[PDB]
């Protein structure tokens, strides 16, 4: 039921999640070591495992309640660990072929977003990839209003239980998002050699950066 | 026939054309004057008319055989004119509230792309909007290969008659695409106050610029 509600709250869910799965599957070996930052119930891990049965996934998140949902989903998988940690805590050593994230880093202050991309590159092997599926701000307040009408169109066409869209609205007034080109530039500053926006549906986008390639 | 085959050849058709319709509908009045550049059989114009029944449409294209198809689709539509004209020819005076384009400007050399953006802004009213649904090149040759596997992934999942993808591959030898951020910078250079990439699916992207807003 949780899986259906995310599809309802996020436009072009398949396109954007899928694009994170595909860019990782064309960047990394079948036996890659992957870190999922703020994995929550571990949906992005799920999509990755569906593509890459032989990959070793570390799921990390500050919320023990969210990771117990992840643990449930991955009950009978041997190649899946869990790590209780804040994004601002020392990252695991790795190294990792891939670090992936969905809808988490927009909860950090801008400066801590720049400090995280630099620390993520340190635990990435050469040729490794960083993939973010992210809530982005429009570049002007006029466009932000258009972004909002488009997100709200998708939610209502999806027949979202109102109680759940009202909650959605409230979680969103603590968010600290930014335009997708500011974030992508920060990848370049942190030293990723190549950074690109792969797919986008107004307020949501999949971007990636590569360490060497 | 034709309409189904475009859905087959073009990932995220509904998202990409749809985002062109929706950014125009939130940018211009119901009675806006719209120019469709390289309108072809005039599928973008159709989408726009479905959304804006009181808008005045001018469909322009160098190919008279394409515009014959457009004339057929708009047989019974009184607010629809046609203009046979090259992108390099003097644009109609207008003014227009919107100038829209789908899968045409990528056929120009890069400097004639920059020159067209500049001439297009001159025929737009203040606060008018330029929208391009476009074939874009990745920023690296390695990513270009990935964009190509994603476009080829959709075509085969869409059960495309091979004879038609064959043709597709050849027409693509005369294409002069460039990455989406270069093009969007050129809107800013040509004097649009705001430019943004709305939606994207690897090799296809919807972007826009605003003349004053
Ligand atoms: N500073 C921080 N450090 C670690 N995790 C954080 C965090 N701020 C938020 N989170 C976690 O980030 C998650 C964002 S919700 C999205 C979760 C999941 N990846 C999905 O896409 O469906 C939550 O589980 C939340 O607990
Ligand atoms: N230099 C040019 N001037 C005008 N139209 C051009 C052009 N180069 C290509 N075109 C036109 O651009 C079209 C490319 S196909 C895209 C057709 C239509 N816009 C759609 O959404 O499907 C063809 O109709 C072709 O004649």
Author numbering:
A (entry chain A), B (entry chain B): 17 to 229
Text from the published report:
Here, we characterize the O-methyltransferases BelI and CysG, which catalyze the initial step of β-lactone formation. Employing techniques such as crystallography, computational analysis, mutagenesis, and activity assays, we identified a His-His-Asp (HHD) motif in the active sites of the two enzymes, which is crucial for binding a catalytically active calcium ion. As expected, BelI as well as CysGΔN16 adopt the class I methyltransferase Rossmann fold, characterized by a core domain of a seven-stranded β-sheet flanked by α-helices. The HHD-motif enables regiospecific C1-carboxy group methylation of their respective malic substrates.
Notably, the N-terminally truncated CysGΔN16 variant was active with metal ions available but inactive in the presence of EDTA. Indeed, the 2Fo-Fc electron density map displayed the structural integrity of the enzyme in a metal-free state. Thus, we conclude that the divalent metal ion is crucial for the catalytic function of CysG rather than for structural stability.
